[PDB]
Amino acid sequence: SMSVKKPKRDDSKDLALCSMILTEMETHEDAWPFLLPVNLKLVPGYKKVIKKPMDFSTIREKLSSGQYPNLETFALDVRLVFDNCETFNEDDSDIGRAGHNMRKYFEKKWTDTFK
Numbered sequence: 001s002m003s004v005k006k007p008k009r010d011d012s013k014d015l016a017l018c019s020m021i022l023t024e025m026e027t028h029e030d031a032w033p034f035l036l037p038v039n040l041k042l043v044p045g046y047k048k049v050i051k052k053p054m055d056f057s058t059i060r061e062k063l064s065s066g067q068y069p070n071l072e073t074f075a076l077d078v079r080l081v082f083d084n085c086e087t088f089n090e091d092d093s094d095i096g097r098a099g100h101n102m103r104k105y106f107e108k109k110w111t112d113t114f115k
């Protein structure tokens with residue numbers, strides 16, 4: 001609170017560390033469903049069902065242009081990709097399995113890098 005500050009975690013390297021984690025997800029072989037925005041004019045249901053679409057290229061653009069205030073807002077957009085994937089796909093499908101795999105892959109890198 002006012003004039004009572006908790007000790008400050010060092011955040012100076014967060015931009016480059018997030019950028020690196022994103023690079024690794026972009027090159028994972030199961031990233032293909034998540035590389036580009038879903039086409040809302042061509043894909044049934046998506047625009048109406050998925051209220052906040054997110055994809056790796058949109059995250060890369062936001063990261064490169066100063067649109068993430070901090071670590072946590074970046075992790076929220078990455079998790080959003082995989083939450084959208086669960087909402088729109090059966091677990092028992094190739095895309096549904098790709099989402100589960102990419103999420104596991106992300107959270108491990110997250111813990112290792114920061115926790």
Ligand SMILES: O=C(O)c1cccc(O)n1
Binds near residue numbers: 043085089095
């Ligand atoms: O064909 C599908 O099941 C599909 C298409 C677009 C996005 C998405 O999540 N799934």
